[PDB]
Design a protein around this nucleic acid. Structure first.
Ligand code: SFG
Ligand code: MG
Ligand code: MG
Ligand code: MG
Ligand code: MG
Ligand code: MG
Ligand code: MG
Ligand code: MG
Ligand code: MG
Ligand code: MG
Ligand code: MG
Ligand code: MG
Ligand code: MG
Ligand code: MG
Ligand code: MG
Ligand code: MG
Ligand code: MG
Ligand code: MG
Lengths: 101, 88, 219, 73, 119
RNA sequence: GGUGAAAUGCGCAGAUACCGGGAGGAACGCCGAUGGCGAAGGCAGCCACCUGGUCCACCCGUGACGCUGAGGCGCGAAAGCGUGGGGAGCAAACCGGAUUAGAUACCCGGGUAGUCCACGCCCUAAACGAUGCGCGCUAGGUCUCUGGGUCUCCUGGGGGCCGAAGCU
């Protein structure tokens, strides 16, 4: 397996419930593909540099997983299927290349 | 790709003696391993010609080390082949 | 009968020909066609006429032969065929078939046949055409510098006055051509003609050209 | 001249690989979404080469712009 | 005849002509002018003077709808684009801001021969 | 709109300029270099998977296993060909406008093949460093990309410039 970094930007207009439901499918999806959730962050809402789906804001989810690379591509096909999901970027984790230090 | 595990497994499985890392037997083994993976990758990706040259070379360096084996020990040779399962 | 297919020569029967021309109201024959350009240009502008070009030298026709077999979108045509033959042995399959026929700027033996004229050969030329088919012949020495030639195959000098003479007219009559018209043309006019030699002659030095036209009467 | 201040010096020890630090990344962008040249980023061939990927990754996520309008003129 | 007051002014310069379009706080045009709208017909149409006249014509006409303040937006480069941005500032309208928003591809369509020979 | 000026052209069935929505194709601004990779042809949005080459340090393993390479096989820009798909922009041919003594051109308006994809074919080039591959030996200086080091410089691999001896 390889350690990755899932990014997900979904509609900033979801209510407490609607939101927690989309996260459901995500967590559900992850396991379905072997995603072993090492951790998570949730900056939530953020003012996008440019509008996405006409909406000028976005809700963020960040998951650092570990899973079978042979499926990482599917994992995202799946994650993009959602209608409230308006961005999905999976990235190979990488040592933090420092600078100006 | 081939994990360090996948690798050393072959290295120890062929080594002539404890700590043997560069015996012709080993090298040939490791090359047979790389070749197969590549030959595989290439059964699909029939367009990735660039990689194919890499294969032409692996196969090259191998058939050339083997050539060296006969010349020297004609026994270890027949031995290596049968084992690795080379020729065809 | 020999036709040209690309750079390759193949046989064509009368029955095949009849089936081809069945799709057309008119047939035009250009005899001693040379490079094929008269037939090609004429063909691109009249899809209601079937064009047959006859020349004894096949390599000359290659460029146009290769062109006509291309796809229509790249200039291919379906109303042109090239026949490989000489006036002295014209294919029987072409007898009594043409609604109109031209010989433009002949030279060598063909020129001798038109201008002396050789009665048997021109009769055989007339034989390709149906009763009253149109014909035109365009010739030009005008002489002098080109001779050489007058000293060689004998030949006419040859003025409009010569083409108007009772003797030439009578000989033509014996071969089946009724002269309807005779015109003297100038260099500027000949540029209309779209053909090897018409162009070469035209942009070259001043020359007298003569166009003789009319109908086939033998039948 | 381009001797106003190197974006690098005018800043702390950051992880050039981090594609979410809109805070710092935004620093290497022209008065437009354009990525500044080393002349102004004060970064090196290697550093500057890693920035680009990061600044581009950040653009897709919507955190950083691709291009901004110019004011004045 | 609506009475807007605050709006936008789009200056579309080009090496052949200048055309100014005034609009309301959100894009819909109120009035428009150009090198042709006024006298000039061919080459003259481009020239900075025309740009000037056209700018003015644009404001004057827009003064009718009760315009007063405008945000200028420059698109393209050409025969006197600055003159237009000036004729406005003077026209009477208080110019709130000038902004270059000339479009540029991130390399998409092969341009016509006339605009190639580059790279 | 377009040009030296123009015209063809488009527009009152409302064009151009402006705002919003959608569809589709092709390319990938800044970073970008005087840069990097590849055997060459050639290769630049970002992401993942599959995969080739290559450098450095340690000197640990094999122990001459090396070099070149007729023929072979493979790869081979563009255009071009075959079947099918796609087609936004561009544009041979072609259709027009203008210029001209003429204009089968250059300029302007259109525009088909093509340019894109797949599968197969073609195999060429100023396919250029106009410089075949490998190895050893013969002052330095300077800038640069990438690795190691006792890291104001030394050391290894690569890219440039200037130049010893020498060569021409
Ligand atoms: N005896 C002949 N019979 C038929 N054709 C002939 C004979 N002799 C010469 N020709 C052809 O006459 C043509 C004369 C050439 N100048 C081409 C003439 C052609 N019609 C043209 O106008 O371009 C040549 O192509 C010769 O091959
Ligand atoms: Mg009306
Ligand atoms: Mg729009
Ligand atoms: Mg379409
Ligand atoms: Mg190299
Ligand atoms: Mg090159
Ligand atoms: Mg040792
Ligand atoms: Mg030993
Ligand atoms: Mg060799
Ligand atoms: Mg091609
Ligand atoms: Mg094709
Ligand atoms: Mg097609
Ligand atoms: Mg054109
Ligand atoms: Mg192909
Ligand atoms: Mg090729
Ligand atoms: Mg170092
Ligand atoms: Mg060096
Ligand atoms: Mg010297």
């Amino acid at each position: 397996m390889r350690r990755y970094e899932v990014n997900i930007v979904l509609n900033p207009n979801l209510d407490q419930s609607q939101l927690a439901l989309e996260k459901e499918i995500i967590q559900r999806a992850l396991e379905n593909y072997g995603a072993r959730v090492e951790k998570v962050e949730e900056l939530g809402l953020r003012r996008l540099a440019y509008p996405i789906a006409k909406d000028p804001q976005g809700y963020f989810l960040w998951y650092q997983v570990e899973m079978p690379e042979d499926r990482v591509n599917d994992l995202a096909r799946e994650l993009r299927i959602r209608d409230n999901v308006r961005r999905v970027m999976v990235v190979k984790s990488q040592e933090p290349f420092l600078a100006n230090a | 790709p081939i994990t360090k595990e996948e690798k050393q497994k072959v290295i120890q499985e062929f080594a002539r003696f404890p700590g043997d890392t560069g015996s012709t037997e080993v090298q040939v083994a490791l090359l047979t391993l790389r070749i197969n993976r590549l030959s595989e990758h290439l059964k699909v990706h029939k367009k990735d010609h660039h990689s194919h040259r890499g294969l032409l070379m692996m196969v090259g360096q191998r058939r050339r080390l083997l050539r060296y084996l006969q010349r020297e020990d004609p026994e270890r040779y027949r031995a290596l082949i049968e084992k690795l399962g080379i020729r065809g | 009968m020999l036709i040209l297919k690309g750079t390759k020569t193949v046989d064509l029967s009368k029955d095949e020909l009849t089936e081809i021309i069945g799709q057309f109201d008119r047939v035009h024959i250009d005899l001693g066609t040379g490079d094929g350009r008269n037939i090609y240009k004429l063909a691109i502008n009249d899809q209601n006429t079937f064009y047959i070009g006859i020349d004894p030298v096949k390599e000359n026709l290659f460029d146009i032969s290769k062109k006509i077999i291309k796809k229509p979108s790249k200039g291919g045509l379906s109303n042109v065929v090239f026949v490989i033959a000489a006036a002295e042995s014209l294919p029987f399959e072409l007898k009594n078939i043409a609604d109109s026929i031209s010989i433009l700027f002949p030279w060598g033996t063909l020129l001798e046949y038109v201008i002396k004229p050789n009665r048997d050969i021109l009769s055989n030329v007339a034989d390709l055409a149906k009763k009253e088919a149109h014909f035109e012949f365009v010739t030009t020495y005008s002489d002098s510098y080109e001779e050489a030639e007058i000293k060689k195959r004998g030949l006419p000098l040859l003025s409009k006055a010569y083409f108007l003479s009772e003797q030439y007219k009578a000989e033509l009559s014996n071969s089946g051509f009724r002269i309807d018209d005779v015109k003297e043309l100038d260099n500027e006019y000949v540029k209309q003609f779209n053909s090897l030699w018409a162009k070469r002659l035209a942009f070259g030095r001043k020359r007298s050209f003569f166009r003789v036209s009319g109908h086939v009467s033998k039948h | 001249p381009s001797r106003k201040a190197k974006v690098k010096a005018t800043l702390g020890e950051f992880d050039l690989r981090d594609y979410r630090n809109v805070e710092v990344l935004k620093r290497f962008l022209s008065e437009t979404g354009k990525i500044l040249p080393r002349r102004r980023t004060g970064l090196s061939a290697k550093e500057q080469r890693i920035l680009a990927k990061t600044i581009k990754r950040a653009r897709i996520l919507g955190l950083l712009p691709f291009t901004e309008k110019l004011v004045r003129k | 005849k609506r009475q807007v007051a605050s709006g936008r002014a789009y200056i579309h310069a080009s090496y052949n002509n200048t055309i100014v379009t005034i609009t309301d706080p959100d894009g819909n045009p109120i009035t428009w002018s150009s090198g042709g709208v006024i006298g000039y017909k061919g080459s003259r149409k481009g020239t900075p003077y025309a740009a000037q006249l056209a700018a003015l014509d644009a404001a004057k006409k827009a003064m009718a709808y009760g315009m007063q303040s405008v945000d200028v937006i420059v698109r393209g480069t050409g025969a006197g684009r600055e003159q237009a941005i000036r004729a406005l500032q003077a026209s009477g309208l208080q110019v709130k801001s000038i902004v270059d928003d000339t479009p540029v591809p991130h390399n998409g369509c092969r341009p016509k021969k006339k605009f190639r020979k580059a790279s």
